[PDB]
Amino acid sequence: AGFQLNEFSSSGLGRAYSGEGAIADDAGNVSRAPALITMFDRPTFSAGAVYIDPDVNISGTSPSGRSLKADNIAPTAWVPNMHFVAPINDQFGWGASITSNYGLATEFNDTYAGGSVGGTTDLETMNLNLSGAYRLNNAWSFGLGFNAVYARAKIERFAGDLGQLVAGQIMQSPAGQTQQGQALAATANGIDSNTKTAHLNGNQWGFGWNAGILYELDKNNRYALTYRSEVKIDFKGNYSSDLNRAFNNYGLPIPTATGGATQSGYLTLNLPEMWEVSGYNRVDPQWAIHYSLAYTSWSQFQQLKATSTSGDTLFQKHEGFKDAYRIALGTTYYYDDNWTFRTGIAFDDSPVPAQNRSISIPDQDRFWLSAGTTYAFNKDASVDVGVSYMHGQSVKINEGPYQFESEGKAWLFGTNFNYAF
Ligand SMILES: CCCCCCCCCCCC[N+](C)(C)[O-]
């Protein structure tokens, strides 16, 4: 799922996020579907956090006989969540919440070899939704939400061995047979591994809305169709490139050189839209079943091109992602007043068209398996605890002169606190 994450609740995690938009057993879900609010008698609160601990790795060798082995580049994270749904009147009621739909954090060492294309890339995301719902007849329920999306990103690449490859390349030719090519090559074979090759950094707020639909057969069965729009973040950050201002103009496909001087960069982060369709079926007094099919247009994520005050290009990477689907199915078992339990499986096809593959966004079809429990205290309180094992598919990624190979697994763990009036 590119750099998109759906950890909005701990009860959600427990069921590998299925039926979401059709399950309102906690305020956690109104975030997915605005229409879910029309399902709450009383004011409900809930806030928790998801503990993400990935295990991605890179392996490989550089033409410079160097090691491209990038061990565990994915850092543990904490994605917390806060929700609040509350009735206004029998046909109307609003809600609010703080969630994070997107995120990314891959980091190698400044002395990595494939460091040209792998060094440090982070993305902090925080969606603030304020949705309102309107019931209609005994089955339909429309919902709408507004979103302010704060982001903090900081890209940073360094020169790995390219200077050495760059050098050899020159000398390996006629150029090398000249005090200049010999000089032009000496300059190149000098570049230490940790020479900041590019630094983009800036934070901004983005805006988007999201509508919802709810149609039910009765208090036990329903289906949903939701829509979360695209979000075009226009940053205004800082650009720094320690490469002398001489490497400039030869058109070497190298990120503009400032000379270590911080210039004023511009970037546009495109957060893909999401459509989703899920259903919920309680077939017994204890059993229930939910499933969903999501489609995210990663088509909208084409590149990341930086640009100066006067409009000239500094940094630029082609993503050319494409759309993709997520699929999920799970069950909820209502034991007694107290105990509740969940399980689930899911599968999402990566949007990265194998070829545009990149070691900074080591993505690979992911597989979810989750289990969780809930324990209500008295019809007004209840704590959530969820866990999920995620695994991917080893891919081959040819970038720059280099060729890598990344495999990755991740284990999840959330716990939310519920309260009502
Ligand atoms: C001046 C803005 C500087 C921030 C640059 C934006 C970085 C967004 C990171 C998310 C995309 C991840 N990727 C493809 C670059 O690895």
Residue nearest to atom 13 of ligand 1 (CA): 361
Query: Which of 121, 156, 239 to probe ligand 1 with, by most ligand atoms within 8 A of CB?
Result: 121
- Can you give the residue ranges of every domain in the chain? 1-421
Distance 316 CA to ligand 1 centre (A): 10
Q: Which CATH superfamily is domain 1-421 in?
A: Outer membrane protein transport protein (OMPP1/FadL/TodX) (2.40.160.60)
Pocket of ligand 1, beta carbon within 6 A: 3, 104, 121, 123, 153, 155, 200-202, 235, 237, 265, 267, 269, 304, 319, 360-361
The total number of residues written for the chain in this structure: 421
Least Cα distance to 319 among 275, 268, 257 occurs for 268
Distance 308 CA to ligand 1 centre (A): 16
Sign of CA dihedral 163, 168, 169, 171: positive
The answer for residues whose C-beta is within 8 angstroms of residue 221's C-beta and 6 or more apart is 279, 280, 281, 282
Least Cα distance to 233 among 102, 351, 360, 129 occurs for 102
Report the distance separating Cα 366 and Cα 327, nearest Å. 11
Token pair listed for 355: 């070829």
Least Cα distance to 43 among 93, 8, 92, 9 occurs for 93
CA angle 339, 344, 346 (to 5 degrees): 155
Q: What is the DSSP string of 30-73?
A: GGT-GGGGTT-SS-EEEEEEEEEEEEEEEE-EETTTEE--B---
Query: Which of 104, 298, 303, 363 to probe ligand 1 with, by most ligand atoms within 8 A of CB?
Result: 104
Distance 65 CA to ligand 1 centre (A): 30
Token pair listed for 419: 């309260």
Distance 107 CA to ligand 1 centre (A): 13
The answer for residues whose C-beta is within 8 angstroms of residue 13's C-beta and 6 or more apart is 7, 50, 370, 372, 386, 387, 388, 412, 413, 414
Residue nearest to atom 9 of ligand 1 (CA): 123
Distance from the Cα of residue 129 to its chain's centroid: 17
